[PDB]
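Deviation from plan, reported transparently: magnesium ion complex.
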Amino acid sequence: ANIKSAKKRAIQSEKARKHNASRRSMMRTFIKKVYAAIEAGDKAAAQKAFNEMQPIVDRQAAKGLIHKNKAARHKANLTAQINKLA
Amino acid sequence: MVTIRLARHGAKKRPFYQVVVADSRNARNGRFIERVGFFNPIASEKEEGTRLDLDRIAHWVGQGATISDRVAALIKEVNKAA
Amino acid sequence: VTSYIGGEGHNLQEHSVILIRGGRVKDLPGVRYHTVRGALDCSGVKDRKQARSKYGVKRPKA
Amino acid sequence: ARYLGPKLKLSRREGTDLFLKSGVRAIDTKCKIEQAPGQHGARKPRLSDYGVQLREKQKVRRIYGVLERQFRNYYKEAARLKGNTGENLLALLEGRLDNVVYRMGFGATRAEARQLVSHKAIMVNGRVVNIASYQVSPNDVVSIREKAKKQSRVKAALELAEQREKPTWLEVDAGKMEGTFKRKPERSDLSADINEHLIVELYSK
Amino acid sequence: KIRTLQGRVVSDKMEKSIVVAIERFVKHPIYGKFIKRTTKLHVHDENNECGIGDVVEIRECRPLSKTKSWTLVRVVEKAV
Amino acid sequence: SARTTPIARYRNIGISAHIDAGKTTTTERILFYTGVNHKIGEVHGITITSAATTAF
Amino acid sequence: VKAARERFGRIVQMHANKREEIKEVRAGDIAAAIGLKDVTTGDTLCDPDAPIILERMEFPEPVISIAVEPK
RNA sequence: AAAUUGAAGAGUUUGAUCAUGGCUCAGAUUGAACGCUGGCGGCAGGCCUAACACAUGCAAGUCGAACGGUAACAGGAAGAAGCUUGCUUCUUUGCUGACGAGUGGCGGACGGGUGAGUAAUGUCUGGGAAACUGCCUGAUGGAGGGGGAUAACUACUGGAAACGGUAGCUAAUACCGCAUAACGUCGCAAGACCAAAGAGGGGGACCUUCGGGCCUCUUGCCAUCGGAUGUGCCCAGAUGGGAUUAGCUAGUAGGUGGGGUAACGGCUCACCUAGGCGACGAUCCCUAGCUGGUCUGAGAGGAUGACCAGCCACACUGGAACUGAGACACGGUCCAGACUCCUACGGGAGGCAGCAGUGGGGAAUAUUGCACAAUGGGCGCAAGCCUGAUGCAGCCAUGCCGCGUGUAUGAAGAAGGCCUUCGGGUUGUAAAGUACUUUCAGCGGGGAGGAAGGGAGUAAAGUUAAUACCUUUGCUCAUUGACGUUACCCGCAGAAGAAGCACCGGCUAACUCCGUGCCAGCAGCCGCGGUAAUACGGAGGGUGCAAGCGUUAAUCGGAAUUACUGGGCGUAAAGCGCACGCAGGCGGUUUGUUAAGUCAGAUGUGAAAUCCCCGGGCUCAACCUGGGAACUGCAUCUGAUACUGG
Ligand SMILES: [Mg+2]
Ligand SMILES: [Mg+2]
Ligand SMILES: [Mg+2]
Ligand SMILES: [Mg+2]
Ligand SMILES: [Mg+2]
Ligand SMILES: [Mg+2]
Ligand SMILES: [Mg+2]
Ligand SMILES: [Mg+2]
Ligand SMILES: [Mg+2]
Ligand SMILES: [Mg+2]
Ligand SMILES: [Mg+2]
Ligand SMILES: [Mg+2]
Ligand SMILES: [Mg+2]
Ligand SMILES: [Mg+2]
Ligand SMILES: [Mg+2]
Ligand SMILES: [Mg+2]
Ligand SMILES: [Mg+2]
Ligand SMILES: [Mg+2]
Ligand SMILES: [Mg+2]
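Because the crystal trials were delayed, the predicted structure below was used instead.
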């Protein structure tokens, strides 16, 4: 980068990348656990995982790491699949 | 940011400004939304050098537009001198 | 291409770097361009003081 | 932008008076009107259909002291203007300032009229102009700066003014040397010896 | 109120979809002769209530597929 | 604007001699002695002569 | 010498460790100009008011002549 | 009133004619080049080639009124007072006027450049639904309580540089929980969950821990629902050439589910069906940014897409994402490829299709200028700072416009030149001389306007506890101009310094003499030159334009010479050797219906500029500009039903 501004933006974007990727990685795991419970056929634990994951996506939506409509899609289709199964 | 701005047309050394509503992210003589009025700082002093439709200006400022410093000087001057 | 050299006499030879212009010569078949006298290597016609601009002749002082 | 050559060769070319001299002496005394310039001017050739139209245009250009660029602009303006282009062009050439300066009596020649207008010697409605192409509108007044009011040349032109015919569309006052442009003259004001449709025939080629 | 186009169905083989041909007369830009121009559209058709040559009423809608943006409103004549 | 150095101070000289009499060596040494003289005054680089140069 | 009109600018001085841009050149000094359209050795560039020619120039006549063809 | 009301031909085939038919010219126009020549000013334009490579300098910063701080210069108190005349004021501390680097916020996705790619993830016109949207707005409400890190810094230390590496320390409007939770999200409902940040100014009673408490003003923060603006998506029509390109497609075409996008969608995946496009030109190949518009044309058309404005696409090339409201980002990151540069050889750096400029290519296209004075943009409470956007300046007759290079008089009419029937005319008022003038250019002086604002205050009103702080409006004061020695005006003297280019056989305005002798040469066409050349070369004379004049290049017109307007096919070019026949084109006549074509009205749109009309300002004009007209093109509603269609 040939400008102080661009240089500073490089390091800031690097920190933002790592920090945001940490939230994304930790977030996807809960959806993956719920999805695994789906063919695991559990009844209490499926809702347990859903109740544990529905708040974590909300912080992400609030800070904008994801979009609120994306979080709505996740929780809506997940609860649809759980209501279908249980 | 919708803003009230002046587009400088006319031959060089004799400006002539078009008072128009536009977007802040556009050039001075670039894409605008709709014309409001004009201004001539080289007016003959015997013919009017500032025409400016206050109706659309009021509509836009109530809509959420921003009036530039030169435009504000014009509103003040027209509302006092007439 | 082949180009025609107008005017009375010329000082042109092998490896001469000229500037040709358009214009077809009817009598010579195959010739469709003229040589601009007074530009680059081509010299002005000598003793031609009518229509000098046609042949790149500076105004003679008189 | 101006002809600096002889002023009687032009008149000899058309075999008619051009009013290019003040008129102190007779034109036929001062030169040979009926003989064209040059050693062949004794012989009268045949003027073609293009010849007569060119001849008339080139004549009018010498009467009114204009060049071809401006004269074509005048033709285009007259053609654009509603009415009859033939007279409209003459109306514009009348509206030429130095022309009305000549007409109202401040110059025995349009050449001297241009000389005077060039040196801020003429003002219109008080405002001084030095452009000879200045278009004069009806109800406008012209005069002289007090510096050039002392000039004897304008005084001498004053006596020739009433010697020649007074234009209708001009009202003058030699007392304080000021004139007024009533309205653009129509066709009949100017001499019928100048044909107008030849011009439009030429420029509608 | 809603817009209205009417055409003739030409292909019904696709499941829950149809192909509608729209014919209109336009004056030729250069010569002036009136020629018929044809546009074919893929129209959503649930329950497969269309055949071949049946005149069809269609309406513009959401993009329901890669090449389907129109839906059946009514069919006016059947079994030609 | 104003002449920083008086015209009388200026010295326009040329080093001339036979081949290998040491003309380049002398010009390089002169440039070095001037550079060191005006660098020591503050403190207690690639150099090429080519055409005419200036020094104090 | 060539009776022609040119303009200066981009004057440069040599300092034995760098070459430095200079805005003006005073009498009794040596300077180099860049972008001169038509100028040769022995040419007097002087103030437009006074066209002066100073001692012209002297060039040694050639002593060795060969013929060069490009190949 | 006014706003498209406008249309020329000529030369050339033949012994001669008519026709057909091609070629050429007379007209406008240019981002022009070159030849000759060249005074001034205004406005505009200025690499059409190599999207060739780039040296050098600038083109994107700001905010201490966010936070830890003080590196550097100016102070404040002290101080051995450094000091002796307290003359000099020689230490100390962010202590602050201010502020480097640092964290953080916002901007860097705007502004600017180019047209390579793209015949369509493009543009123009008209429609839509399934979306998002920083800053600027409007309303409803919250803004409580903590925690863990880390930069800078310290210590050590690697490095030539670029830049670092380990161990501690330090905050925040950085980060993260917790509290709260609705007109928000999910869920048929019950129910579950989601955020925040403070910072500056002043202060009456009280006030200690002198830091505070509290109160007031301004501003910022959080959630929602809006508006505006901007953007994404979809559909229809239109938007080059080629059949010596006829078949093309396999996520292909549709469907069911699952995933994914801000949003709908083979976006994507797994199955299932067997599609889909194409002669109304698919596929393939070549070319190409598109539009408003520009040139031309009577129009219909033709050519075109510089400048100005809208949109698109690109940023050494090929990819890829990250951050971010917004990018797959000209001056940001990673990888690969080609190229170049520095080096201590240990390793590093870069991308002018930004402003200038360089080389190279070319017939050809300019200065490494100034100012942020004005408009505008970014940041900031403001002042301010940045802005190669912009304003201006320089070069270029590159175009348009204007104006000058003198005015009047001046005769056997000088000299000389030219021809001459030796009579003369001729250049020619032309010159010389005589009176007048100074436009412009020079000199010296004066002299607007582009300048609004913003500061020091001064008064008045709101706000509260406040005659504080702040907000709003008048008055005083100093002022703010790069251009710039501005436009413009004034006095000097002198005509003083300012004309050239092309042509003269016909087309086509302009004619003789002398040289040569089918040579030399001219020529757009027809054609001139073989001893008288109005056509070659020179002179004289004349003609046409003019600070320009010619040639060349290119487009249209003339060309009704691709004929839609508006052509032909017996012999001039042109009826397939003939027939059947699909597609297509067209189709007797009446009754009813529909309203597809057609027509009427309305409405919305057809960006602005440009064009055209009437007016205004630059002394006029070019130029700038107010209003109109036009943009007849598209959509949608309502009708009309004679004709064509169903
Ligand atoms: Mg001119
Ligand atoms: Mg030796
Ligand atoms: Mg040596
Ligand atoms: Mg190349
Ligand atoms: Mg291309
Ligand atoms: Mg960038
Ligand atoms: Mg760059
Ligand atoms: Mg450049
Ligand atoms: Mg800077
Ligand atoms: Mg043609
Ligand atoms: Mg035609
Ligand atoms: Mg024919
Ligand atoms: Mg035949
Ligand atoms: Mg037959
Ligand atoms: Mg058939
Ligand atoms: Mg019928
Ligand atoms: Mg209808
Ligand atoms: Mg207008
Ligand atoms: Mg318009």
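Chains B and G do not touch (no CB pair under 8 Å). We consider this an acceptable substitute for the interim report.
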